[PDB]
Design a protein around this motif. Structure first.
Motif: not given
Length: 239
Positions: A75-80, A196-201
């Motif tokens: 929920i929180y990451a999708e929104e961010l 979202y074509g974004a980055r995470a670790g």
């Protein structure tokens, strides 16, 4: 009453920096903001899930809690990523380990995460979708730890839906294949970043050895947290 940009976040669009650190415990997010951010303001308090935006060494940075488990971080990451246009999320957490060569207080940098959740099969027509950290994020964490002379373990995590496992044979299989970290969220974060074509670790410190039953004391957990958070913060400067 305030306008709600999402059902779970009162922050206005633009109130989050492009880079966000997230931890499970909102009170730990507050501790991070209070001790490491400047120009800091609280931007969310919905459901107690405190989030803050400020700067670290002049660079915009936010920190927010994510709660426990894949559904909550999702929920929180999708929104961010979607509403707040965040580009990079680093999860900062604690974990257990079953690996014989990983020890309590070790710092673990996650390259990919397995799971017992269905959320990734649902995204890839029922097949195996590896929840995979972004390479630039992993490298930034590795290089920051090297510069700080903090040893790290680099490798796979396992994100479980069930903290209170009753599953025979699981620990032995995780050890056989050298999973270094057992936690509950990272496997849900990485595929959302991909969407979202974004980055995470993810970076975590070992609080408990599941096999030997060694456990870190409160003071030891504070020291491990200080090491991990400095690595994460310095990594944001490269991202």
């Amino acid at each position: 009453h305030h306008h709600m940009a999402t059902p779970h976040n009162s922050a206005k669009v633009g109130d989050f920096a492009e880079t966000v650190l997230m931890c499970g415990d909102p009170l730990r997010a507050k501790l991070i903001a209070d001790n490491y951010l400047e120009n800091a303001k609280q931007v969310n308090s919905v459901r107690g899930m405190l989030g803050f935006t400020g700067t670290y060494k002049g660079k915009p940075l936010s920190v927010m809690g994510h709660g426990m488990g894949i559904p909550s971080i999702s929920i929180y990451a999708e929104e961010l990523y979607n509403v707040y246009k965040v580009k990079t999320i680093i999860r900062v957490g604690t974990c257990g380990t079953v690996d014989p060569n990983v020890h309590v207080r070790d710092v673990c940098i996650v390259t990919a995460s397995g799971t017992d959740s269905n959320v990734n099969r649902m995204r890839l027509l029922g097949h195996d979708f590896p929840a995979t950290a972004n390479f630039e994020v992993v490298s930034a964490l590795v290089e920051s730890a090297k510069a700080l002379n903090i040893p790290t373990q680099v490798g796979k995590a396992y994100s479980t839906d069930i903290f209170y496992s009753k599953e025979q044979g699981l620990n032995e299989a995780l050890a056989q294949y050298h999973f270094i970290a057992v936690e509950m969220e990272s496997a849900g974060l990485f595929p959302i970043a991909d969407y979202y074509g974004a980055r995470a670790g993810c970076i975590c410190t070992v609080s408990d050895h599941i096999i030997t039953h060694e456990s870190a004391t409160p003071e030891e957990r504070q020291t491990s947290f200080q090491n991990m958070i400095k690595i994460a913060l310095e990594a944001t400067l490269k991202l």
